[PDB]
Design a protein around this ligand. Structure first.
Ligand SMILES: O=C(NCCCNc1nc(Nc2cccc(NC(=O)N3CCCC3)c2)ncc1I)c1cccs1
Ligand SMILES: O=C(NCCCNc1nc(Nc2cccc(NC(=O)N3CCCC3)c2)ncc1I)c1cccs1
Lengths: 657, 12, 656, 11
């Protein structure tokens, strides 16, 4: 099938088909004279049964769109033989967003890094649409192209404006196009069920198309799931897409014709940080609104999302809770605003937060901007510690087990099973990777904290021994005088009351045992603060996984084998028939898939999970040991200001003859 | 699960 | 059985003739499968010239290899017969990742292999070679296209020896007579008897492998062969011989740079080599003794094994010289004490252990002279131990090799374009390597200067914490103790004690005043606005947010993919018409991307690095000068506290 | 230099 088509300047092979639709096909072509490739869109023979009024609808829409996040329409030429108008537009090799969301890596949500890029580009393009006055009512992951930027960072772009119209900000259409799962309810009603009633829509459908897309890219799952799959139960799908209560972003049905579980929260399987979910779920619950009353406008949406995109991330790790946190804060905020963000995520008050960073405390003045903070990463975060007790939470993942392998040799039934069984092991690999970082950040901060209790202990000795000398020679300043108070004169047989300077001697000397008992009390502190003490991190290098164990690398090696089988089974499920030997290998490798998934899921729960929980217990007992010692060291620290302010007023009386 | 059979030189 | 042209089989295995892994004069190797299981194996069938080397003496070699089981030997499972031809076939373990040669043909490794992988190669090659010597099998044929690579259970690669094509059973010392191998990795004795059809009574030992091991290691370490006669070594059959024979003692590489001209003999690694300076000083002597042509000064295996075992048994502590802007890997033994650690820092940075100050994770590092290196702080390369002296040091920076792009030849040549895309992509690979190193060095300087400045604040606070203790004694234990009871004799009593000590009290008290004058100046110089500021550090140089290395990697991937296509375009000697023009267009695209990357590398990464290097160098002066000045005040404090420590010893007399 | 342009009938 080496047939081809060409225009005046481009040519393409019919076999080199990129995408496909009901209205046109998309090919990988080249410029005849430059060699550079473009995506060529030729319209099939059935698109010329549409009116000439409607076959220009996509042509005038793609004309008034020139922007990144919009697939660049390079030119528009006529094919040689058929004289059909075709669209020469830029070619994105990396596929669509749907191409990405099908990777088993992102089966439970995109990495939080990429999600912010999808957030950035979708809004930027969708804004450029309403800004130029076009409502593209077919926004779906298969529609959002991905191209690699000059800096390696992804850049997403919109296309496939076959479902478009010249929409004004208060105009509404009565026509029908789109794809099921990512379409507004009052367009799903008329398009799927051919049932129309009492509403027309314009510029509000896309907010729903965007919101459903964002939930998919965040959780790896569609937000509104009827049981038996979403292929049928359209009556149930509409029961969920419209009967959903305002403020709940997901509607899933567990049973067959059973309940409709509503939820306003992200699932535990989500990959995004908790600091982001609290910012994100409001946006989803307000563009996932059927009616125009309780819904958000484009004005409010673009303002709220830009607030998220215009923030910066400061990584903060709670040492008493063993929980990482991402602080989404503007660069113009203050330090006292920062403390508020940390309270909402850790439930520890602003007045209780000490900031350890790179083996040092952190001078935290409220009049300092966020951009002048020390640069933070997830591996080099700002630690936070509190002198009041906190529950050691730890990582809270979702316990996911493997699905049940089916013995029926089914080409697409094994491909669908290979996707999920690899995704489950993929999630466990991501969790074991986080469990490693949580343990390694524990070791990093505890060592920095121990070095700070030594700075707290060494600081008092420099002050206590500084008042032990202020009292050493202040007590002999009136002892060399009371020595001669009766050396030249009356016999000093015993100690009696002599004058105003006799009580400033018998009570001031009491600060030699009341303070002498502190010098011996600090020794018990320095003992437990020493290598052999009851506060050593000897267990920290003894419990839990280590990076030198390479547990994550071992899991990744099993996962590669599982992934190679899955990518093979999708080649197999294309053309649903296999030769004899090929069928047997498929059956053999199907069993190896279960072997690798079992070995992986075993090593996760037995080596990574078991030792992490063992590490979380040997650290729960050390939190109390340390927080109790800080309570004692500070009580001794405050005594050296009650002993030294007392030897201050009596220091004036002792400077005399 | 025991559907796979031995490979054979005559199918190749 | 098969249809004679597409597949063969044994009783237990079968394979397609298209799934061919390797060819050879005696045999070919295919990718096959166990019949009853489906699992994969490499199948080696001996068609022709299997009868050239005797069958019985070669069959007994197989049975003893069937019992061989080691990590670094490709397992020989069973030995069978092909169904119709009845040729002997060996079933072996399949290594999907290919050979070490495939790894060295990547552009990423066009120069040094990454140090991590090189240690793996050194470990496995030595491990496998020792297993053969301990079982009495001579390889005499080892080359990169011969060392297989598999991915272990932990993702780290595991190399496995195979194709003992020159092999028989050997003792520790006897006589031989054979000829097998490839030209480049060959001992000079065999290079005459296998390339230039000329024989002599020259003998061997355990050393003929040691030369091939030496040439193979140098290749993996530098990306090039150690002996190159002007043109390709495969063309100058005579000049290549003249080099290895007259190889001077100590030299490990000889390259003829001018045609029929002199041969530049080098005794150390090229600058382009990726390996650390710490490892080079250990690897170079090993390569020297094994690349010895004559058996009189060669090493022998017992010494070669224990020597490389020492390199492998060492761990690495990462150390960054803050004043020199140089990173260092320290190959120390786990049982080695802390004292020898300082020795290794000396040999690399010229900093004696008396002025070796160590910072790690925000604080100084105290070094107990007997602490074991297996309990040092764990060090990554981005989390090293910083070393500073109070003594001046030349700020060196990173020493890389200025490698410009080759001249892209304009002629349409399927072979030339493929061989040119290899080199030019490798140059952008080396440039991207350095671009990442430069950014690390700059980010480590920022992490070090930030810590050191905070350390000087600790040294400052320690001395001002001491000044408040001698003044609370000088002004109180002397000015008050003496003025009350001692300067009131009006008659031991009134001697040089009242005259000299009262003056020295006021000598020290008045001079101590201007010590506070110089102390607040130092506090001002390391305060926010002072001459010692982190300001220029956050302003000069490239940054992670710049994403230079990512930008360079994007260009490199387009070049890499064009090269991999030109590789397949070379598989055909002739290209179809439209394919020829794509290859002609992508050739210009390949050179466009390269010059674009080299521009951004030199104008962005290099410049701002060198600009950062200068503002670094000028800050070292102002830093080292401030520490010398604060120290002089610190010793004045102890001096004043010492002078007063005995004047107070006579104020406690109190007999007047 | 010397690159030729693509053609349709050759595909
Ligand atoms: O729905 C549709 N098109 C979905 C995308 C096709 N559109 C384009 N593609 C590319 N480059 C490219 C390269 C490799 C892979 C892919 N993507 C796919 O293969 N996918 C994505 C969804 C499922 C299968 C795209 N350039 C430009 C476009 I315009 C359409 C129906 C009618 C027009 S478009
Ligand atoms: O040439 C030879 N042996 C070198 C390897 C062939 N032998 C084996 N191969 C594998 N797995 C494997 C997988 C992918 C590729 C490859 N091949 C390469 O990467 N090549 C081919 C030559 C240089 C680059 C091998 N397992 C076991 C063996 I035994 C020989 C010629 C005659 C005997 S051996």
């Amino acid at each position: 099938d080496g047939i081809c088509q060409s225009t005046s300047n481009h040519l393409w092979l019919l076999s080199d088909i990129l995408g496909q639709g009901a209205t046109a096909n998309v090919f990988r072509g080249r410029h005849k004279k430059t060699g550079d490739l473009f995506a060529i869109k030729v319209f099939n023979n059935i698109s010329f049964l549409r009116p000439v009024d409607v076959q220009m609808r996509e042509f005038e829409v793609l004309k008034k769109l020139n922007h990144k996040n919009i697939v660049k329409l390079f030119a528009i030429e006529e094919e040689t033989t058929t004289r059909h108008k075709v669209l020469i537009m830029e070619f994105c090799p990396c596929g669509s967003l749907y191409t990405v969301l099908e990777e088993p890596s992102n089966a439970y949500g995109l990495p939080e890094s990429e999600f912010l890029i999808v957030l950035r580009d979708v809004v930027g393009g969708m804004n450029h649409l309403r800004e130029n006055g076009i409502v593209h009512r077919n926004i779906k992951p298969g529609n959002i192209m991905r191209v690699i930027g000059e800096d390696g960072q992804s850049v997403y772009k919109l296309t496939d404006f076959g479902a478009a119209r010249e929409l004004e900000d208060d105009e509404q259409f009565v026509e029908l196009y789109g794809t099921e799962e990512y379409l507004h309810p009052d367009m799903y009603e008329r398009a799927v069920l051919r049932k129309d009633h009492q509403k027309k829509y314009g510029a509000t459908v896309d907010l729903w198309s965007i919101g459903v897309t964002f939930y998919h890219a965040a959780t790896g799952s569609l937000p509104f799931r009827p049981f038996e799959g979403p292929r049928r139960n359209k009556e149930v799908m509409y029961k969920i897409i419209t009967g959903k209560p305002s403020g709940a972003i997901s509607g899933v049905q567990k049973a067959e014709n059973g309940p409709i579980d509503w939820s306003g929260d992200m699932p535990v399987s989500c990959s995004l940080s908790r600091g982001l979910q609290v910012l994100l779920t409001p946006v989803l619950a307000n563009i996932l609104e059927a009616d125009q009353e309780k819904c958000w406008g484009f004005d409010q949406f673009f303002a709220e999302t830009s607030d998220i995109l215009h923030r910066m991330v400061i990584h903060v790790f709670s040492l008493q809770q063993m929980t990482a946190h991402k602080i989404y804060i503007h660069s113009y905020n203050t330090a006292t605003i920062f403390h508020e963000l940390v309270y909402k995520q850790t439930k520890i008050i602003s007045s209780n937060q000490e900031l350890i960073y790179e083996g040092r405390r952190l001078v935290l003045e409220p009049g300092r901007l966020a951009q002048h903070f020390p640069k933070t990463t997830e591996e080099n975060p700002i630690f936070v510690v509190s002198r009041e007790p906190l529950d050691t939470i730890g990582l809270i993942y979702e316990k996911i087990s493997l699905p049940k392998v089916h013995p029926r040799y089914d080409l697409d039934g094994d491909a669908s099973m290979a996707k999920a069984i690899t995704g489950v092991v993929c999630y466990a690999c991501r969790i074991a990777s986080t469990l490693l970082l949580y343990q390694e950040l524990m070791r990093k901060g505890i060592r920095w904290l121990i070095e700070l209790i030594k700075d707290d202990y060494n600081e008092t000795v420099h002050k206590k021994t500084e008042v032990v000398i202020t009292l050493d020679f202040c007590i002999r300043n009136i002892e060399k005088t009371v020595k001669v108070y009766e050396k030249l004169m009356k016999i000093n047989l015993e100690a009696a009351e002599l004058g105003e300077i006799s009580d400033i001697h018998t009570k001031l000397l009491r600060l030699s045992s009341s303070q002498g008992t502190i010098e011996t009390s600090l020794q018990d502190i320095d003992s437990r603060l020493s290598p052999g003490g009851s506060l050593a991190d000897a267990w920290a290098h003894q419990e839990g996984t280590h990076p030198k164990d390479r547990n994550v690398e071992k899991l990744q090696v099993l996962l590669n084998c599982m992934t190679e089988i899955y990518y093979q089974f999708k080649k197999d499920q294309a053309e649903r028939r296999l030769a004899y030997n090929e069928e047997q290998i498929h059956k053999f490798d199907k069993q190896k898939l279960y072997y690798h998934a079992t070995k992986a899921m075993t090593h996760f729960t037995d080596e990574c999970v078991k030792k992490y929980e063992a590490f979380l217990n040997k650290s729960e007992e050390w939190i109390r040991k340390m927080l109790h010692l800080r309570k004692q060291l500070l009580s001794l620290t405050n005594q050296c200001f009650d002993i030294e302010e007392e030897v201050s007023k009596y220091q004036e009386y002792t400077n005399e003859l | 699960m025991e559907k796979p059979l031995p490979l054979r030189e005559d199918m190749w």
